[PDB]
Structures are given as C-alpha cells and as structure tokens.
Design a protein around this nucleic acid. Sequence first.
RNA 1: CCAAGAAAAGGACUGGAAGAAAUCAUCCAAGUUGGGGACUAUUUUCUGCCGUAUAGGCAG
Lengths: 342, 300
Amino acid sequence: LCTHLSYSRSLSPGKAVFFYKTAESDFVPLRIEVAKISGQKCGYTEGFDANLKPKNIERYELAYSNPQTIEACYVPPNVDELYCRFSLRVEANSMRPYVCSNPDVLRVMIGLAQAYQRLGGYNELARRYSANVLRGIWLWRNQYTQGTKIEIKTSLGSTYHIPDARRLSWSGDWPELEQKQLEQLTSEMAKALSQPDIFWFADVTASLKTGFCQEIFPSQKFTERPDDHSVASRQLATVECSDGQLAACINPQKIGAALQKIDDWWANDADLPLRVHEYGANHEALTALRHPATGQDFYHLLTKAEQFVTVLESSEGGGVELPGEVHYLMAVLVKGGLFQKG
Amino acid sequence: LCTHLSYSRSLSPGKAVFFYKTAESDFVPLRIEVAKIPQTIEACYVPPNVDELYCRFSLRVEANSMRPYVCSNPDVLRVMIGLAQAYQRLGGYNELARRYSANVLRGIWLWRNQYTQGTKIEIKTSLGSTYHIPDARRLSWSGDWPELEQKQLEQLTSEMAKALSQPDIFWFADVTASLKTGFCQEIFPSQKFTESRQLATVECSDGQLAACINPQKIGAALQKIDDWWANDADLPLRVHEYGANHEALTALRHPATGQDFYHLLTKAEQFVTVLESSELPGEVHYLMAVLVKGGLFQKG
RNA sequence: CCAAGAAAAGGACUGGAAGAAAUCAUCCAAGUUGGGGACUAUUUUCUGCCGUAUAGGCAG
C-alpha cells in the first residue's frame, strides 16, 4: 500500500420525514410530545451485590416507583394513513480513487474496476440494492402495519409500484408482476453505477396504514445524561419546517445503513446479510465475522489485486465465474473511506 | 449469565379515548373544564342528555419472545432458544393466552370507571372474527363463566395463542366498550404527574381536546396475572421481577426467599432437562411471563 | 536588671521637538444509540328554597 489512498461515497440518501394530509392542507408534520412517568424498581443490582449477598434493603423499600422523563410520539385520533418520504442520488463514483499517491497502485485499481465492469457484476450489486428498496426494510421498527404501499419515481421517467410490500423475502421467489419491476429497476441502477455524467435521482414515498393511536419510532439522539431532572433521559430527532414547526424524522445514515445491508458471502453459508464492514462486524451478536486472524478481512484482500485482475482476464464473463472475494472488495469500494498508512 | 442480554416487548396497546355520538356527527370528544383560580381546579362528567359513553383502544400482539434481542454469549443463547421451543411444543402458550384473554373480556382496564348500569364489550380482529360480551359486570377471576361466554373465551384464546407463538402473522384487535351511565356521572381519566393536580388529554386532528387513559395504564391492567406464589391464589399481581405489591407496600418474591426472577434465570439448564423428560410447574410459567414483558437482564 | 540609659534630616525645582509595515495563498475523505415501566391513596366540599336561566343571590 501507500501513504494516501481514498474513495468517496458513491450512493446516498438525504433524510426521511413523517407527515399526514388533511382535507384543507396538503402537508402537516407528525410531532413529538414530552412526559413524566412512574417506572419500576427492577433488574440486577437493584437488589444484589455480586450475586453474593443480596443487599440489605427492607421489604417496603422496593414498592416505591422510579420516576423518569421521556419523549414519545403517537399518531393522533382519526388519521387514516401516515406518509414517509425521502430522496436518493446515485453516482458512478467507484471507478477512480479520490486521492492516490502511487502511480502503480492507481493503474491497478483502474484496471480492476474496468475488468469487473465488462464481465458483468454491477448487475449483481444493483439487484441486491434494488431488492432492499422495494422490500421496505428501511422503516426499521415501523414495519408492523396493516398494509404498506411503496411507490418510486425517477429522473428518467419511470414509475414503480408495489401494492403491498409486507411479505417480500431476501431469499425466495417474488409474486408475478413484482418480480418484473425488480428487473426494470435493477437496469436503471446498474447503469447509474457504472456510466459517468448521468444525473440519476429517485424519489421514494411509502404509505403506512396504522392502528387507532399506534406509536411511531423515529431516530433517537445520542446524548449525555442530564442531572437537572427536567431534560428527558430519552430524546428524539426532529427537523424544522420552513415555517418553524417541528417534525419527526429518520437520520440519513440510518436509512443508509438499511439500504447497504448486503453481505452474505462469508463462511459459505448465507444466513442473514451483514452491513458491509471492513472487519465483518455483527452488532446483534456483539462479534466479528472477518477478524484479521482469519485472513478474510478487507486489508488482506486489498493486497492481492494484481492476482485478481490476472484471473478476471483469463475468465470469459457473462456467467457465474466471479468469486466471492471480488464481489466483497467492490462492495467496500462503493462505500468509500480511508484506506491508508501503508 | 453474561454482560449483555435484552428482550423487547411482545404485547402492547396504544391509548384509550373517551367519546360520544350525536345525531349530527359520529365522534364528539368528552372534554375537561379548567378554572385558573397555575393553581387550578378542574372537572369532567358526562353532560346532560348523553345516555352512553364510548371508550376505544387498539392492540397488537407479536411473537417476539422466541428470541433475544441482544445476547453477548453463545452458550446463553443456545439455552434460551432451546427453552422457548421446549415449552412451546408442550402447550402453555394456551395458558398464558387464556389468562390475557380473560382480562380483556372482563373489562378491568376501565379501572375506576367500572361502576355503570351495564357495560358491553365488543372485539374485532384482523382475521375476521367478532366477539361480543353482552354484560361484563359478572365475570370473575375464578369461577365458571356462563354458557356462550365460556365459548368465546376459548375462541379468543386460540387466536392469541397463535399470535404469541408463530411469526409473520400480523394480528390486530380493536376493542370498544360501551358504558351505560347515570344522570351526570363523573369520569376518571389518567392524571398528570407533576413536581393542585391536572388531568391528561389528547389533541384531535381538528384541534379539540379529549380525555384519555395512558398506554401503560391499560397495559398494567392486562398483564396482571401472577398468582403462582405461596400456594395461595388470592388475586394476581402485576408481573414484576420481585413480586411487588403496591397496596400492602411489600414484595412477595423478595430476593431473600430465592423466589425472584434472577435466581430462577440461572437454572435454565435444569428446566430444559425436565421439559425433555415430560405437569408444567409454576417456576417455568413465571419465567415465560417475564420474558414476554421484556426488558434489560444484564451485568451478570 | 538587655554592646545598658537620652535623641525632629529638613527647605526649592517645566523633558521636549519630528514620522507610511507591506506584496501572495484550496482542510479534505467514511460512519446505526438501543432495550422496560400505574400519580392516586383513609379522600374531607354533601342537602335544599327564590330566580325564564348550568347567569346572579341565599338558609342550614
């Protein structure tokens, strides 16, 4: 490697905002409320010292409540449906290093991205990204509706429509006349990723049919603990409207983390996909699947580029010849960052 | 045990709103009057000429106690998974579903407002069922329910037993009750917690305010089905890791007895072994009930 | 019961004049804060007559 090497971010959303319509006004934001509640005195160390001596606490001393201040958000009475919207731009920006201080590293990385493009493979990545948009997984914990309808528009004049996204799996065979739209959307994106000077925008709107006063789950703030007993212990993220009203939202990178959740190339057993990560981090299990000790991480693989190009050149393409290691590497170059200090 | 372990909630309501009908419009809110006297006084009662008051809320149930939300230990995880399934296949979800279902049909979530001239409860679900309790004033915790009512308890138990145990079923219920009332009967909505007192309301889409009962106040009523201690059923407690009893200011499963959640959590290896030899004992019923009301189980 | 004992440093005074700190410039690239929850209790505010009246005035 070398002293300077970096790629920029080739695929990205802006943020998502929740709102609803009225008969008199087209845009009314969903907003949050603040309240004091009475909690439970419970859990370990409420009553134990190192699971050894149970603490001295007299019986009556645990019947007391534990008050807390929290923010919360609910849909108001008599609204028929809730809307959520965001925009997405895609750039063909993995073809060339943003910065590179080594002429030989540069010509190789260029040779590789091109060797890959002409054998196919952007179609593979585009199919996986497209599936994640149409499925609706970017709603995170708000997917549990009575019916979810998703509509997509693009700058090239296309429109896509999924009447009900509640049941499309990662692995399986999609219903007819939906399988078809996945192919069409894949084609627009596969192009957007590899041809320069196309300004491609998508506009994604979804509708959520909900319960009478169903709770909504927007992004939380990462905060320090207050000690004035007035500031909430749990705070939610909002945006300002042009007229000063506040609205609940989902953060840009929170939408992004969902869209790029594509990686089932490890251990030769697909399971569930991981968020692309140089070390294969798995948050739910608090572990890592491509620990440097295995030889399967990004940095080990980054140093074999000369060998991969040689293989790709001997292949024909248009088939299933590309190995898991080449796909992994391309996925990381798409989520660009700093790859330095050789 | 281990450092990180969490479950999320598997059963939850939204909030309850009070309203009445007119000949001119179907939803007119019950409102609250305030005099500034800051330090205020306020009141709420059914106004003249309204014969009955309506109360409504929604409920979602999710099969979410089958797997840890977070677990940092592969051996703790293997066991908790084996246990939930060892239990599921012997039944027992029926028992929990029976207990939850009984409370909805009885109507105790109305708290202090149960004293009517006749309360009727109607339930609709996302699978196309409808249930009807013509009069909720006569159903006890313990006793045999009258005919045609015992039957609906079984039918509702079955739908919920599934909602709690099999994934990818999206099960919603919509619960409305009618309170036949007195001449100008006083109504008791949730109070505001402050550092005189104030009452809680919600905003309507048209700007009017309405009286309500908080989500967790409805929830606390539904989950009150713990009577597995001391071989004396009495009335049930709200499920709590320490068996708290607010009325008497005490605790029934005080850690000093060895009967709390945390002592029991560490015997999972032994329970699975028994289930394999299987009868379900109070000790595993308690544990399953706590996992359903999920929370933090950490710093072992 | 001290290298012991005693003690008025005072009166007067002009620092001034004059000055140019200036010319040039890319801080950039990537990122999941999350899981659970009862403000009401041993409360104090009932029962009536006049007045078209949920207005306003009154006995107990």
